[PDB]
């Protein structure tokens, strides 16, 4: 079994709208395609003993005995590696359950599709499933050590990509509120929202956190000075530049119960909490002295409380207590530690509520100061601390006290956050009773913290958990405001680029910044950002991440959808223009019914409050209306189309071409926008395919709320001139002669241009172009089309590229054109550059010549030799 190709999908796609995270593996069963399980001796017992957990899988029968039964039956291996890749991820805690298989290409090649949680772990599990299954169809088993090492690699891959818990907390609430989110390429930042409404976060810091507030909060001496000048209670204390001056400093504080800290930070290290004697002060000094250069603060009694303030308003309060044991019967300290460290709520870290208590030299040091050691028996209800400070990560506890805080203390905490200048802040308070004013209990404010963590508030050991994230998202995205900008997505086999540029032009008349992507470039308000084929999810992301964009208009191609899914999840308007047989055989899409499922992805992601715009003159497109959860609007070139009539009778909206006008039917009323003859993109009203694109753009603008007058202004001033849209209807006036340069690909474009030619109000109709060798066997069809339109048909297909042989393509065109109508001066010339398109005076005055060149760049350089007007 070989893997030929792997795709990673990230967004709504062909296989599923909801299952956004999928891996598609193209698997070649070189062997096994001819051996349906029962032809592989031992491949049942080996599979169940290596992976005994492959039991719950229902596969297709629908019950718990569903899979495995299918292994006893003649199931092929490409359907089995799919249940192994899912199981290998489940065995390491990553839950995934979706999967499918399809046969493609020649017999034996399959598409294996499965769900992933982590992108690298997903691809890893796929490769591993193939190795496991291949060994078992060769030998009868798989070494245990070759299974355990793979499970170890999956566990590491899924750990390395994890978001920290403070970001998980914000992201989860954002999803509940339907706010889109993305990871950014730098500094572990996350973006929330689109375009002009975007916000950024990094853990517990945000786009609203100022630098001056954050730096002041990290300066302990600066913070103390600012707060005491505001009348806020802080500890009494001084500083020494590592001189042996403690004997004097203690005198300013007022006595020996003092606190000695390192003069700078290095985590919670080097701190002595309650000094009572000179010799203790000396020991405390030598330890504090290890760091860079308050040392003697007065010691205050009370508990350690953490207060969380988010936007100048109190959110949560928690009381923190250090790891300890108590006189829970007449047991020793070592016995008590083992007794409580068995509690089911303790273990590891962020895995459970509490962690384990660890005895180390620092636990011994803390106990010695209390008069105890491990072999001592405690008196009933005596409490012994094993740590100097509280922390959940070291085995302490946290108690919710949010509803017990006095109204005056609430006022003071909010004032502290505003004085320093922080949006999200943690405040460290020492007090004996949080339910009484700090001035009565003689409490103090010890510290202010920028970017505080949330674990003690969202997962307390006692009391009720609090939703901390909700107040954060409320300041970033205040109630009543949007987090998204309008998205207009355009798809279909032909006409996307033209429709996209017109629609962007119309929105631009409102004065907003409009960004759009097409197959030519990425633009913002008429400035080019990038050039080249910019369709696909990577370009859509440039516009959506751009801080200036107010409206996004995106042309969407099948290549991008099949390769990586859609970039945006949902949109306001989804436009489907047509389904036609181009690009068949590529991407495993062989039929027209399948191509219709690819295009329908846009219609199915339109938000229920939005609209789908469908072509009522197209049988595959109109049919999509029964899949759409959104409202449906229709357009047509025929006012009598039964769909349109049935729809407006139920008070729907439609756009039709009638009486020379482009108009909107809204219920019983008709709104005329303009005449086809007065809209420049339509060639004097003689190009039906241009009219149809204008109708789709006008209807999309209308259903999304633009006024009719704005729409009229936009269609009247929109141009598709030469050197703006090369290769797309470039008509040149060259003496008493006209010639058109275009670039049809599939046959629908040869017909669309042919209709323009039929309507030419002049003399002879000539054609001077044709298909290259990259086409399927449709040369006769293309020849038949030319024969129905032109009276000067000259065959050219023996070009400079010559993808296949020489002039055979031209001969096949000749067979087609003479089959349909052997009456158009059917010369074969082959030289498309200095003959076919040079002897144009063979055409009667004011006739029309249509060029379908291999390259429009050359065609528009050559047409110019006649001095166009």
């Amino acid at each position: 079994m070989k893997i030929l190709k792997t795709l990673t999908l990230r967004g709504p796609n062909y296989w599923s709208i909801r299952r956004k995270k999928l891996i598609v593996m193209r698997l070649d069963l070189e062997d096994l395609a001819e051996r349906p399980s029962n032809s592989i001796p031992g491949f049942y017992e080996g599979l169940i003993k290596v992976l005994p957990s492959l039991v719950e899988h229902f596969c297709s029968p629908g019950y718990q005995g569903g899979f495995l039964e299918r292994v006893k039956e003649g199931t092929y291996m490409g359907h089995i590696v799919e249940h192994v890749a899912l199981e290998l991820q489940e065995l390491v805690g990553m839950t995934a359950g979706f999967g499918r298989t399809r046969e493609t290409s020649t017999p034996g090649v399959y598409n294996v599709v499965y769900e992933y949680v982590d992108e690298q772990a997903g691809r890893y599990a796929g490769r591993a499933a193939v190795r496991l299954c291949r060994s078992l169809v060769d030998t009868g088993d798989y070494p245990r050590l070759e299974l355990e090492k793979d499970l170890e690699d999956l566990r590491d891959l899924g750990a390395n990509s994890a978001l920290g818990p403070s970001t998980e907390t914000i992201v989860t609430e954002a999803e509940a509120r339907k706010i889109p989110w993305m990871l950014l390429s730098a500094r572990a930042m996350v973006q929330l929202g689109y375009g002009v409404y975007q916000q950024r976060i990094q853990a517990t810091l945000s786009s609203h956190s100022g630098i001056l507030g954050v730096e002041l909060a990290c300066d302990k001496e600066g913070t103390k000075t600012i707060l005491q000048d505001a009348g806020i209670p802080v500890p009494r204390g001084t500083t020494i530049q590592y001189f042996d001056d403690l004997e004097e400093a203690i005198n300013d504080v007022g006595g020996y119960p003092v606190v000695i800290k390192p003069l700078d930070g290095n985590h919670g290290r080097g701190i002595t909490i309650n000094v009572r004697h000179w010799q203790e002060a000396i020991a405390a000094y030598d330890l504090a002295a290890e760091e860079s250069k308050i040392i003697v603060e007065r010691y205050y009694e009370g508990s350690d409380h953490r207060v969380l303030v988010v936007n100048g308003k109190l959110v949560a309060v928690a009381e923190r207590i250090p790891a300890h044991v108590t006189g829970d019967g007449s047991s020793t300290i070592s016995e008590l530690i083992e007794k409580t460290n068995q509690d089911p709520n303790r273990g590891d870290g962020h895995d459970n509520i509490l962690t384990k208590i660890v005895v180390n030299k620092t636990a011994i040091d803390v106990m010695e100061r209390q008069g105890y050691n491990l072999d001592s028996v405690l008196p009933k209800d005596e409490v012994v601390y094993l740590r100097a400070t509280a922390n959940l990560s070291t085995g302490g506890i946290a108690i919710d006290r949010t509803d017990d805080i006095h109204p005056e203390n609430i006022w003071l905490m909010e004032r502290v956050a505003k004085v320093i200048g922080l949006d999200i802040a943690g405040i460290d308070v020492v007090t004996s009773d949080i339910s009484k004013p700090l001035r009565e209990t003689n409490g103090v404010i010890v510290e202010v913290n920028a970017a505080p963590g949330f674990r003690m508030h969202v997962a307390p050991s006692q009391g009720l958990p609090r939703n901390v994230a909700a107040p954060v998202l409320d300041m970033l995205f205040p109630p009543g405001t949007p987090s998204r900008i309008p998205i207009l997505a355009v798809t279909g086999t032909n006409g996307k680029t033209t429709t996209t540029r017109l629609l962007a032009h119309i929105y631009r008349q409102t004065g907003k910044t409009v960004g759009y992507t097409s197959t030519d470039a990425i633009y913002i308000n008429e400035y080019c950002v990038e050039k080249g084929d910019n369709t696909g999810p990577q370009s859509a992301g440039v516009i959506l991440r751009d801080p200036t964009v107010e409206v996004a208009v995106l042309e969407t191609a099948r290549g991008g959808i099949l390769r990586a899914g859609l970039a945006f999840d949902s949109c306001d308007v989804g436009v489907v223009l047509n389904v036609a047989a181009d690009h068949l055989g590529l991407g495993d899409i062989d039929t027209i019914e399948q191509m219709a499922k690819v295009k329908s992805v846009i219609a199915e992601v339109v938000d229920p409050s939005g609209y789908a715009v469908l072509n009522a003159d197209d049988p595959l497109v109109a049919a999509m209306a029964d899949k759409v959860k959104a409202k449906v609007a229709y357009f047509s070139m025929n006012p009598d189309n039964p769909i349109i009539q049935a729809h407006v009778r139920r008070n729907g909206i439609a756009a039709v071409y009638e009486s020379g006008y482009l108009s909107i039917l809204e219920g019983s009323w008709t709104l005329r926008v303009e005449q086809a003859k007065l809209i420049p993109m339509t060639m004097g009203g003689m190009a039906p395919f241009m009219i149809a694109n204008a109708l789709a753009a006008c209807l999309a603008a209308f259903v999304n709320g633009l006024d009719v007058e704005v729409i009229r202004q936009g269609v009247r001033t929109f141009t598709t001139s030469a050197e703006q849209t090369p290769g797309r209807m470039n008509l040149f006036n060259l003496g008493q002669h006209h010639a058109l340069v275009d670039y049809a690909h599939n046959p629908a474009g040869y017909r669309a241009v042919g209709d323009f030619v039929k309507n030419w109000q002049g003399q002879r109709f000539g054609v001077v172009g044709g298909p290259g060798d990259r086409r399927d066997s449709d040369l006769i069809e293309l020849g038949q089309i030319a024969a129905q339109v032109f009276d000067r048909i000259i065959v050219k297909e023996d070009d400079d590229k010559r993808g296949r042989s020489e002039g055979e393509t031209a001969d096949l065109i000749v067979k087609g054109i003479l089959q349909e109508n052997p009456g158009a001066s059917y010369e074969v010339i082959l030289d498309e550059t200095i003959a076919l398109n040079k002897a144009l005076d063979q055409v009667e005055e004011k006739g029309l010549v249509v060029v379908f060149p291999e390259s429009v760049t050359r065609a528009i350089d050559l047409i110019k030799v006649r001095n166009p007007i």
Binding site: G164, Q202, T204, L205, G426, N449, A451
Partner: peptide, 4 residues
Amino acid sequence: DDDD
């Protein structure tokens, strides 16, 4: 240096 980011969950204080």
